[PDB]
Amino acid sequence: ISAVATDPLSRLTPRPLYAQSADGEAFELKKNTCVSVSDGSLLPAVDVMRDELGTSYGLKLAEGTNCPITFTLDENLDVTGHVGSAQSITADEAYTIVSDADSVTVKARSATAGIWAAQTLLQLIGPWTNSTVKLADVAFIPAVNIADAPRYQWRGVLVDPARSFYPLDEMKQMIDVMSAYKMNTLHLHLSEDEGFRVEITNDGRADGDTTDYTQLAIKSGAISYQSAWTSNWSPAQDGRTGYWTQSEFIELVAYAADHGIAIVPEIDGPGHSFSLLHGLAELNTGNSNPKPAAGEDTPAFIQSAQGRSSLATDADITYTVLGHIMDQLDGMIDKGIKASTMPASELKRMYFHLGGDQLFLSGGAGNKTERLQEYLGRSGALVKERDKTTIVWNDGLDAVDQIPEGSVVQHWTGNAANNASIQKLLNQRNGKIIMSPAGNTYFPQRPGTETTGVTWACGACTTSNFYQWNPTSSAGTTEDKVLGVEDALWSEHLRSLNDAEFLMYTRMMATAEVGWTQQNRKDYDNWNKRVGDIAIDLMNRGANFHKATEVTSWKGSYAAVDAAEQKVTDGKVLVGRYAEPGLTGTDGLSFTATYTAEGGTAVNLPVTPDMKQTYSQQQLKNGRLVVNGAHMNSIVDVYVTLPSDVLAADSEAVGRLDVSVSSSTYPIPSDSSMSIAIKDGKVTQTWTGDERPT
Numbered sequence: 001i002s003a004v005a006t007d008p009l010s011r012l013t014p015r016p017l018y019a020q021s022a023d024g025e026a027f028e029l030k031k032n033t034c035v036s037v038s039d040g041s042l043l044p045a046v047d048v049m050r051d052e053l054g055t056s057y058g059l060k061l062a063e064g065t066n067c068p069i070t071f072t073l074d075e076n077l078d079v080t081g082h083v084g085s086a087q088s089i090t091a092d093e094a095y096t097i098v099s100d101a102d103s104v105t106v107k108a109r110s111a112t113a114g115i116w117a118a119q120t121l122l123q124l125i126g127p128w129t130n131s132t133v134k135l136a137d138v139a140f141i142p143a144v145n146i147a148d149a150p151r152y153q154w155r156g157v158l159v160d161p162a163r164s165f166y167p168l169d170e171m172k173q174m175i176d177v178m179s180a181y182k183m184n185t186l187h188l189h190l191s192e193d194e195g196f197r198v199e200i201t202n203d204g205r206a207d208g209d210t211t212d213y214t215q216l217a218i219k220s221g222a223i224s225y226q227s228a229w230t231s232n233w234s235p236a237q238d239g240r241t242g243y244w245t246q247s248e249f250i251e252l253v254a255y256a257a258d259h260g261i262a263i264v265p266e267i268d269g270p271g272h273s274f275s276l277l278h279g280l281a282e283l284n285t286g287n288s289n290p291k292p293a294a295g296e297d298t299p300a301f302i303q304s305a306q307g308r309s310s311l312a313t314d315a316d317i318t319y320t321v322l323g324h325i326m327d328q329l330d331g332m333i334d335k336g337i338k339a340s341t342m343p344a345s346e347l348k349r350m351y352f353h354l355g356g357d358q359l360f361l362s363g364g365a366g367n368k369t370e371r372l373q374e375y376l377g378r379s380g381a382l383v384k385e386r387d388k389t390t391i392v393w394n395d396g397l398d399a400v401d402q403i404p405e406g407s408v409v410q411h412w413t414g415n416a417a418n419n420a421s422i423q424k425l426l427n428q429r430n431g432k433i434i435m436s437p438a439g440n441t442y443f444p445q446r447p448g449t450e451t452t453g454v455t456w457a458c459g460a461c462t463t464s465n466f467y468q469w470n471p472t473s474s475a476g477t478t479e480d481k482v483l484g485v486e487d488a489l490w491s492e493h494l495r496s497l498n499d500a501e502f503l504m505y506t507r508m509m510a511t512a513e514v515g516w517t518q519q520n521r522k523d524y525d526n527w528n529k530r531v532g533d534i535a536i537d538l539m540n541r542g543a544n545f546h547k548a549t550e551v552t553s554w555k556g557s558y559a560a561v562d563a564a565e566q567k568v569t570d571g572k573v574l575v576g577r578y579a580e581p582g583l584t585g586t587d588g589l590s591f592t593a594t595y596t597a598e599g600g601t602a603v604n605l606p607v608t609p610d611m612k613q614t615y616s617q618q619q620l621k622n623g624r625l626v627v628n629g630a631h632m633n634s635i636v637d638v639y640v641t642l643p644s645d646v647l648a649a650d651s652e653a654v655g656r657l658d659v660s661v662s663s664s665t666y667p668i669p670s671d672s673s674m675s676i677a678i679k680d681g682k683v684t685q686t687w688t689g690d691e692r693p694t
């Protein structure tokens with residue numbers, strides 16, 4: 001038996017609405033293959049393709065006229081011929097692909113649908129398109145007929161930088177993988193008891209508002225989740241401190257927009273609000289809790305404060321401050337979308353997340369409920385007057401009557417179908433639901449019984465728990481009331497992108513399928529079989545992931561490297577890469593490499609496999625998780641040593657380089673053949689065809 005590429009259509013995640021093999025040969029991408037667009041708004045889709053294929057395959061994908069690859073914008077694109085009695089789509093995100101040996105024809109209902117088409121094409125090309133080095137093979141798009149649209153319009157990840165900051169470059173790496181699986185929403189949990197993570201300035205304050213907002217990021221940027229206030233397996237390291245400057249936050253929005261992802265900000269209140277009291281002297285007033293000590297302007301960041309926070313629900317300044325933070329986030333979001341090449345009509349998400357987590361009661365100026373009803377009535381009024389829809393967590397529905405009509409609950413705790421408050425919001429107050437039930441969507445829930453993490457929701461919430469649910473059924477409502485789903489990355493215990501990606505992947509790709517794929521097109525075993533290729537692409541991106549035991553498709557894959565762009569050092573040159581999750585070293589890999597000259601016989605070449613990092617599960621030291629203890633092995637660089645007499649040839653020499661890999665941990669060996677040209681001890685050209693390209 002011998003390793004081959006999976007049937008390209010078999011790879012697609014999320015599973016599209018409709019996908020069939022068309023007749024005949026695949027389309028071959030050439031260095032100079034151009035792309036035609038009907039509209040400038042579709043260039044961002046072409047850019048997503050060029051950003052990968054420029055590096056992996058040397059593709060220019062220049063914009064041209066009468067190109068074999070076309071993106072056409074069709075606001076009336078009709079995929080309903082593929083929507084059965086049992087199916088439901090949000091058509092704004094619909095696209096089609098019709099391809100053959102000669103052409104690839106994309107229609108997109110929106111600019112965002114263009115990017116989804118591009119992500120599908122990059123999956124069809126295969127799991128090496130994020131290669132950091134130019135590959136020797138040419139790229140092919142199979143002859144296919146695809147009609148696609150998502151079930152749910154809202155397919156998101158909550159990121160919590162408030163417990164522990166994530167620098168902009170790490171947020172971009174999350175957006176990359178979110179976009180790759182057609183996630184369209186990045187919910188930013190900007191503020192908590194333990195931090196505030198975006199700069200707020202004093203530009204454009206309301207008349208007579210003399211609040212100094214600049215202290216918010218300066219004081220509450222400098223705090224984070226404290227290891228010392230834990231007695232469990234939480235890392236010895238405190239949360240990362242810091243905040244995004246306005247220009248960093250504008251760049252975050254712009255980058256998200258150019259990948260089809262809208263920003264949804266959350267400023268949580270009246271509870272989980274200690275960062276606001278700690279940052280703004282002005283918010284310490286009326287029934288705020290806790291109070292600053294002996295002649296202090298702001299309460300101290302100390303263990304007794306944790307879970308005991310309340311904004312002043314009875315004070316005008318609370319709502320002045322909230323209004324200005326909302327205005328400033330709105331301004332930065334508009335500036336981010338302006339900096340993108342994507343349309344505001346698609347990427348400006350007219351929602352604001354108030355949170356609504358219960359405040360702590362200390363004094364006697366109201367009951368917890370009454371204060372929450374004051375706070376969400378008044379803060380709900382701010383959102384409505386900015387032409388936005390309010391979102392609250394389950395706790396916020398103690399104020400279901402006070403929040404505006406048409407408000408949204410983000411469900412995480414208990415059975416939504418049986419929740420009187422949720423059913424009243426949906427049924428009597430024209431509301432809608434975003435589904436984040438902890439047991440199906442909370443990344444800190446440990447992904448396996450061998451792992452260390454949060455256990456309360458499932459014991460271990462595996463890819464099975466993340467895949468095998470129906471958000472509409474779980475909400476006990478109709479399709480039209482379900483906006484969709486969000487995963488949650490809470491950062492009490494997270495200190496790095498590597499440790500976040502351990503929890504996020506591959507479970508996020510199950511959530512992506514829940515958000516996108518039709519309920520009657522879902523098949524956990526089929527999704528499980530696609531994870532092998534998902535992992536090969538994550539390894540190419542340098543993204544970490546949990547090597548879950550329930551995944552049956554972990555595989556090795558070999559790709560020939562274009563040695564023409566690699567240096568020969570002491571006769572050694574990089575000719576291949578071998579990706580296989582879980583390698584603890586290279587000694588379980590058996591490589592055979594031969595060079596066969598024109599005129600020659602097979603010459604065995606010494607093979608030098610090189611793997612920078614080895615695979616490790618999580619590591620505990622003194623009862624606590626080590627930061628980055630769980631890490632994936634590197635892709636193996638496969639070097640051969642070329643013979644001295646081939647490298648000393650004053651005349652060009654052509655030969656065939658055949659590389660075989662057998663793995664102790666993956667039972668299907670790979671075979672690779674490419675032709676190489678060598679002159680003056682350097683590889684000048686490689687090719688995998690029967691004909692040398694000219």
Ligand SMILES: CC1=[NH+][C@H]2[C@@H](O1)O[C@H](COS(=O)(=O)[O-])[C@@H](O)[C@@H]2O
Nearest residue numbers: 393412438442443444445454490491
């Ligand atoms: C909406 C909501 N409020 C709480 C709650 O979810 O769980 C989070 C931790 O999740 S975990 O660790 O999976 O249990 C926590 O960070 C957040 O403050």
Ligand code: NA
Nearest residue numbers: 122123126129
């Ligand atoms: Na790909």
Ligand code: NA
Nearest residue numbers: 562685686687
């Ligand atoms: Na080549």
